Design a protein around this ligand. Sequence first.
Ligand SMILES: [Mg+2]
Lengths: 84, 81
Amino acid sequence: GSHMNDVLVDAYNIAKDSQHVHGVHYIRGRNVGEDVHLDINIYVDADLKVFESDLVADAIRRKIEAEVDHVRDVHVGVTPVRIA
Amino acid sequence: SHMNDVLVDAYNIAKDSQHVHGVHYIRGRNVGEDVHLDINIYVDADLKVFESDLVADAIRRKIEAEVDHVRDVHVGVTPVR
Ligand SMILES: [Mg+2]
């Protein structure tokens, strides 16, 4: 039936403990038929380079797509934060 | 942090409410210790405006009553024919 709960938990848990993630900013799940479309946005250090943040988002995407059932069209966005 | 609990509990409250056809989407945002929650439910297009309003409101009340760590809960509706 609904797979949202599993998708959101498993995806969040992947994102929150990936490298360079200071914390999850937001997560959004939308049901479309049997699929869940997922948008996650992660906080990263404002001083990270673009190439590095691009790799992080892509890794998180790859891992969610590999391990989380019922997911479609996963998007991982990044928000800079100043780290004291 | 508390996101996982907030999303699951709130989704479950919404989905099991009478007059909800299904959950359309759910969004959690972390702001410090708080989670801000937006949830959107599918309802029958023929519900009256007053009725859809009562459903959304009841969901909001229940989530605010039962789900720790939530702030600024918004329940929106999407009509379905
Ligand atoms: Mg896959």
